[PDB]
Design an enzyme around this catalytic site. Structure first.
Site, PDB file in Angstrom:
ATOM      1  N   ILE A  10       0.840  -1.187   0.000  1.00 19.26           N
ATOM      2  CA  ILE A  10       0.000   0.000   0.000  1.00 19.26           C
ATOM      3  C   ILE A  10       0.878   1.240   0.000  1.00 19.26           C
ATOM      4  CG2 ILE A  10      -1.468   1.417   1.454  1.00 19.26           C
ATOM      5  CD1 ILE A  10      -2.968  -1.062   2.275  1.00 19.26           C
ATOM      6  N   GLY A  11       2.034   1.128   0.646  1.00 14.09           N
ATOM      7  CA  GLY A  11       2.953   2.242   0.712  1.00 14.09           C
ATOM      8  C   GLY A  11       3.997   2.077   1.795  1.00 14.09           C
ATOM      9  N   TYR A  15       6.514   5.564   9.810  1.00 14.91           N
ATOM     10  CA  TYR A  15       6.840   4.510  10.763  1.00 14.91           C
ATOM     11  C   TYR A  15       6.652   3.149  10.091  1.00 14.91           C
ATOM     12  CZ  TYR A  15       6.306   8.037  14.567  1.00 14.91           C
ATOM     13  OH  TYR A  15       6.417   9.123  15.411  1.00 14.91           O
ATOM     14  N   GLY A  16       7.650   2.702   9.333  1.00 15.73           N
ATOM     15  CA  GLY A  16       7.546   1.403   8.686  1.00 15.73           C
ATOM     16  C   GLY A  16       6.853   1.311   7.336  1.00 15.73           C
ATOM     17  N   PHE A  78      -9.358  -1.603   5.807  1.00 13.29           N
ATOM     18  CA  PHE A  78      -8.884  -1.198   4.497  1.00 13.29           C
ATOM     19  C   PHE A  78      -9.885  -0.272   3.798  1.00 13.29           C
ATOM     20  CE2 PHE A  78      -6.251  -1.556   0.829  1.00 13.29           C
ATOM     21  CZ  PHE A  78      -7.093  -1.551  -0.278  1.00 13.29           C
ATOM     22  N   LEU A  79      -9.388   0.833   3.253  1.00 10.14           N
ATOM     23  CA  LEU A  79     -10.245   1.745   2.495  1.00 10.14           C
ATOM     24  C   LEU A  79      -9.616   1.703   1.123  1.00 10.14           C
ATOM     25  CD1 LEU A  79     -11.207   2.873   5.356  1.00 10.14           C
ATOM     26  CD2 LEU A  79     -11.966   4.756   3.956  1.00 10.14           C
ATOM     27  N   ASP A  82      -6.586   6.814  -0.933  1.00 17.05           N
ATOM     28  CA  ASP A  82      -6.246   7.947  -0.090  1.00 17.05           C
ATOM     29  C   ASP A  82      -6.510   9.235  -0.855  1.00 17.05           C
ATOM     30  OD1 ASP A  82      -3.851   9.097  -1.468  1.00 17.05           O
ATOM     31  OD2 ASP A  82      -2.787   7.349  -0.742  1.00 17.05           O
ATOM     32  N   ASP A 123      -0.247  14.780  12.594  1.00 19.84           N
ATOM     33  CA  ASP A 123       0.364  14.676  11.280  1.00 19.84           C
ATOM     34  C   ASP A 123      -0.632  14.454  10.150  1.00 19.84           C
ATOM     35  OD1 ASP A 123       2.483  14.731   9.466  1.00 19.84           O
ATOM     36  OD2 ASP A 123       2.798  12.580   9.568  1.00 19.84           O
ATOM     37  N   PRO A 126      -2.987  14.578   3.154  1.00 19.29           N
ATOM     38  CA  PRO A 126      -3.794  13.848   2.176  1.00 19.29           C
ATOM     39  C   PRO A 126      -3.584  12.334   2.167  1.00 19.29           C
ATOM     40  CG  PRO A 126      -3.202  15.979   1.284  1.00 19.29           C
ATOM     41  CD  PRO A 126      -2.402  15.805   2.563  1.00 19.29           C
TER      42      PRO A 126
END
Ligand SMILES: CC(C)(C)[C@@H]1CCc2[nH]nc(C(=O)NN)c2C1
EC number: 2.7.11.22
Length: 294
Positions: A10-11, A15-16, A78-79, A82, A123, A126
């Site tokens: 997903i990306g 943080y990880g 899960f969506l 983004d 934080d 988008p």
């Protein structure tokens, strides 16, 4: 994890790394964030675990917090997309105003809830805002930066975006207030409207000066106590505030006055999420369905 079948990356959050994963035991697909390590602080784990109870229609549900083998996993609902990707996808046409207003409204609702529960996001960006086919938008990673303190970089040694950072954070304020999220959301609101980031700083000072150039260099008049802030320098250039109608054309006066309230320098003058929900900009808010390409 061993209980999951990675589908895609997903990306890679700050943080990880984040993975779209299917629970080979329930079949439901989730977003799995893997966090970076000599033991790991249990202070941060209890703070995050508390986020599991923070359930609201405009907050991405945090399903589980698992600490095992010096790794911290965050299991999120899960969506499918983004807001950063949706904004890029709408770059040529722009997101219709009714949908921007609906999204802003829902996010203020999510914030009013988090803030009424003394939880700050810290934080907002988008990439942190998730949308679904039904027209809903949700805040994700809420209260994460708290018990962790934002790291200079990310997992892949990428770069932390400062474009949505409130001025008090940039000026070294030790204590964050709910006002920092309102500022971030204001920046996002403006970016949805104009299709360009409001303050695309590429360093802390560039971020700061981009803010100053547009809203004017703050002083004790508009922001009492500003000159006593840790990173405040009397040597800051003095920029005159820019006519606001130039900031977010062609947004209407109601939208502009609400945005100006979300971007007041003094965190105390900055509008709360709850008050914002009562602003006249939302008198005709509706809930449009976005056109999503999944
Ligand atoms: C940690 C970040 C990357 C901000 C999100 C956590 C929860 C989530 N749900 N769907 C998604 C998603 O990216 N859908 N495609 C995410 C990602």
């Amino acid at each position: 994890m061993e209980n999951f079948q990675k589908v895609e990356k997903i990306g890679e959050g700050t943080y990880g790394v984040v993975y779209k994963a299917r629970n080979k035991l329930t079949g439901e697909v989730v977003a799995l964030k893997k966090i970076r390590t000599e033991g790991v602080p249990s202070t941060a784990i209890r703070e995050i675990s508390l986020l599991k109870e923070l359930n609201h229609p405009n907050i991405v549900k945090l399903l589980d917090v698992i600490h095992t083998e010096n790794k911290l996993y965050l299991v999120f609902e899960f969506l499918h997309q983004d807001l950063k990707k949706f904004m890029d996808a709408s770059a040529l046409t722009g997101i219709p105003l009714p949908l921007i207003k609906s999204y802003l409204f829902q996010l203020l609702q999510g914030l009013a809830f988090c803030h009424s529960h003394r939880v700050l996001h810290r934080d907002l960006k988008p990439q942190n805002l998730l949308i679904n086919t039904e027209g809903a938008i949700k805040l994700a990673d809420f209260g994460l930066a708290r018990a962790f303190g934002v790291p200079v970089r990310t997992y892949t040694h990428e770069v932390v975006t400062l474009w949505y950072r409130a001025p008090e954070i940039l000026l070294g304020c030790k204590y964050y207030s709910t006002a920092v999220d309102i500022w971030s959301l204001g920046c996002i609101f403006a970016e949805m409207v104009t299709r360009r980031a409001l303050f695309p700083g590429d360093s802390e000072i560039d971020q700061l000066f981009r803010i100053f150039r547009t809203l004017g260099t703050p002083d004790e008049v508009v922001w009492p106590g500003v000159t006593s802030m840790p990173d405040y320098k009397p040597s800051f250039p003095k920029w005159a505030r820019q006519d606001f109608s130039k900031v977010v054309p062609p947004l209407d006066e109601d939208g502009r006055s609400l945005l100006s309230q979300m971007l007041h320098y003094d965190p105390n003058k900055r509008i709360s999420a709850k008050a914002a929900l009562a602003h006249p900009f939302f008198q005709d808010v509706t809930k449009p369905v976005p056109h999503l390409r999944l």
